[model samples]
Target: ALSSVVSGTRNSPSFKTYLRLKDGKIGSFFHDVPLGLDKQKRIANMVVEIPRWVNAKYEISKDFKANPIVQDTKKGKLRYLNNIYPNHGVPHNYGAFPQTWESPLESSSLVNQNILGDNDPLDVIDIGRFVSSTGTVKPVKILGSLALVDDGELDWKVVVIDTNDPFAAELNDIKDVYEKMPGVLENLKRWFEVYKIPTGKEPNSFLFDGNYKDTEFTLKVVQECHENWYKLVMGELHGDNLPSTENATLPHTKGNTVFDVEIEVSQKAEQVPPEVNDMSFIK
Candidate 1:
């Protein structure tokens, strides 16, 4: 199901991995892929950044060539989610929708007049059985969304279910999620609220008193963000010098620079730390 060839070492920084398309071209998982898998059915594609129960935090970098998957770093060190009590890592298949940009300048009416986009792609959380690999593009049906106002910004977390899931046929909206998967929506809200508390930051707050918006509202939000992305890539709206690359749908002038060069895939074994599961620091 993957159209891009994943090649590179998992832990090495020197040989960064990339997802290259069959045309020998590398498109940004953030920018190139279409937002809708089935426009009529309102299904969208999600590019997985962090799998369920995983700790290492990875994100699509806009500055990087073709926006490759890179682990989020702080102060020249790797970053990982903290194990705060019962919640160890990401609760679900966390990812983002392609071709949708949450522009920081634009005001989001769904949350508040002053609150703006978080300057990233719309984040999605797939509540399904299978754990996805990083860079795996999975088609999902939007169930609902939580308007998380993190640090004074409107960061919408859209909840979805994988199309291939057995319950996908029955679960159509946020109400269905409540009926089939009890406590999931509440757990999702609680996880986000307290996940950063271990790091000493204040707990995150949400819009609408932390209520998950319905599917119709979620779809409208995605469509608005998709339009924002289209304007950004087409040069109609200016980004904070965010680099553009070869895109499938847009007529952008910036083509991929590294696609032509034959970079050797790293064959070295991953060096797993001995204390990988150690959580003594939390104490």
Candidate 2:
């Protein structure tokens, strides 16, 4: 029901992409989508920003127009995660649940009260299939969560499985994940622990000594983050200061005409910067 539309030139400053709904309206990968697919079943909608087996490090841009899914960058060059040990790239379909955020201004009591949110959307790791394309919205059920502490901030990674996956019917909780996929949970913990190391940064730590919590606890965490996002979009809490027009469904943003208009991709390509190729990091 949702698809991606790329505009401008790749590897250039003007390059960007956005989600186009089935109705042909522009959608914000960060804001427009709902959190829950079936609330009673605890199934949430995840916007795939970085597909499995990819090292491009794509993400929903917090600072861009329409909040498009774009490759993350640092120091004026595109950034890619080094091929992690025992894993070629991201092990799962890595993305975020829309309409949910780990609020930077608020600390989650569900997690350590001392730890604040990662100032980003609640991250989801779909352990089902390889979601190859970016900007695909898939329904998934929360299985468990890993409390990753990145530089003193709480960046919770919720483990989930696509509802359509064959394993979803049986893999309902954290225990199921452990019983069904033995090395996955362990490998995931190790992956995040050392992912930043190759980039010349200190490895991240975890809450509860790197143990993943169960479904009941993970659902509570997701609910809390959804509330935080609601407060942000409703203007009850100060957010990242992105323009309201970036969100297509908001009442205030509805008046913005850009969402009704279609965007066109650039036919000509921009030359990749020579310095970009020179600054590559090796694992």
Candidate 3:
């Protein structure tokens, strides 16, 4: 009761309170919350968002923020999202773009009418030799995108490269990847096509939509997402359409907001327990 109330609704107090409850929600490191800018970061002319490594699994969607894992935000206890380790690890580095909104209701006008966006800022997969960590803003270069109709949602996995990454200059687009290693494309398709099939119920239906558009298209997607992000922040895209409560939680973004990820050598670290138990982020 006292924990969830709208007390000290203004920025200073509530925000500090928000800090203790940070990792509760599906953690969004870049969402302008109190600790985001202070912790999650971005480089001047190189990187855009800082990625927070979620899972290396092919199918596990276990989320994280810093080290403290959120077993169950509601229960506030220790618990992992699944029955085990993620043997089906992704081959590429993964994370979400901060402040960029990919509304679940967003539709792509490209192939098969993408009537539903994946609800997270265009998911990104950085392919290179440099693996990421929980709060790293690695420099990136746009490669292309894999337009996927995930669970009937327009989920676009944007491929990119760390500007200062392994084999950095040799690859830059989808074609480059295929040109260098042709089977990589097919392998990616196979993985995304059925990452979420419970045991053996037939993989969830998916359409490639296509692969490797261009850096220009990649930039276009980024700008488009940023535009909608502004709309949501300005009270234009209300409710669940906004980024997330932590992002939209602020009274207003008078100006300047947003911030910063990672990967594994087989790692699962514990997160700091929340100091404020029930901040009622559900609102």
Please, what is the TM-score per model? 0.88, 0.87, 0.59
List where candidate 1 sits over 4 angstroms from the true fold: 6-8, 14-17, 37-39, 242-249, 252-264, 267-283
Query: RMSDs, each prediction?
Result: 2.8, 3.5, 11.9
Tens digit of per-residue lDDT, candidate 2, span 125-188: 9998656578888888889999998988988999999889987999878989888888889888
lDDT of 1 by residue, 1-283 (tens): 3455545566555334355665656666876677764656869999998999887778887766667777777787666777555655788989899888888887866554678788899999999989998888879999999999888888899999989999888888899998899988988988877777766788899888889999888998998888888777767775575546455435544442444424557677577454434442332
TM accuracy, model 2: 0.87
Tens digit of lDDT per residue, candidate 3, span 74-129? 24333211211222245556655555666565455455553676666557777666
Candidate 3 regions exceeding 4 Å error are 1-28, 32-88, 109-114, 198-210, 238-241, 245-283
lDDT of each: 0.77, 0.78, 0.45
The residue-level lDDT of candidate 3 at 61 comes to 21
TM-score of 1: 0.88
Alpha carbon deviation, residue 168, candidate 1 (Å)? 0.6
Backbone clash tally (model 2): 0
- Give the winner by lDDT: 2
User: Which candidate would rank higher by lDDT, 1 or 3?
Assistant: 1
